[PDB]
Amino acid sequence: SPTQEGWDLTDKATGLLELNVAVNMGEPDNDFFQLRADDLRDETAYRRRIQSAA
Amino acid sequence: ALNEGQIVTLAVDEIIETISAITPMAQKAKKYTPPAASMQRSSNTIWMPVEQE
Numbered sequence: 001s002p003t004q005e006g007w008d009l010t011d012k013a014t015g016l017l018e019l020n021v022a023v024n025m026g027e028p029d030n031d032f033f034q035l036r037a038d039d040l041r042d043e044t045a046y047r048r049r050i051q052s053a054a
Numbered sequence: 055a056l057n058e059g060q061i062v063t064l065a066v067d068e069i070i071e072t073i074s075a076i077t078p079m080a081q082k083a084k085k086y087t088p089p090a091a092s093m094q095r096s097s098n099t100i101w102m103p104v105e106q107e
Binding site for chain 2: 038039
């Protein structure tokens with residue numbers, strides 16, 4: 001708020017002002033990979049990749 | 055005589071069999087299924103011992 005001095009104060013009334021801040025989002029973050037079905041005979045690398053992605 | 059509606063019917067159970075399915079050479083061949091997990095890491099190659107002299 002403003003503060004004002006004196007007795008008269010005539011024609012010197014102020015208004016109200018409240019400011020704002022905006023919160024937004026970003027883009028999604030991804031781990032994205034492709035595997036052929038022959039690569040899933042042993043799936044250990046696939047699981048370890050999931051853990052690395054986390 | 056009797057002029058009525060006509061139909062065309064297909065035999066549900068009778069299939070004309072053509073092309074023989076003989077595989078004389080493949081039945082004399084041996085079949086091997088190696089462990090797939092190791093096959094994946096071994097470039098789909100496995101080594102077989104030969105009987106030693």
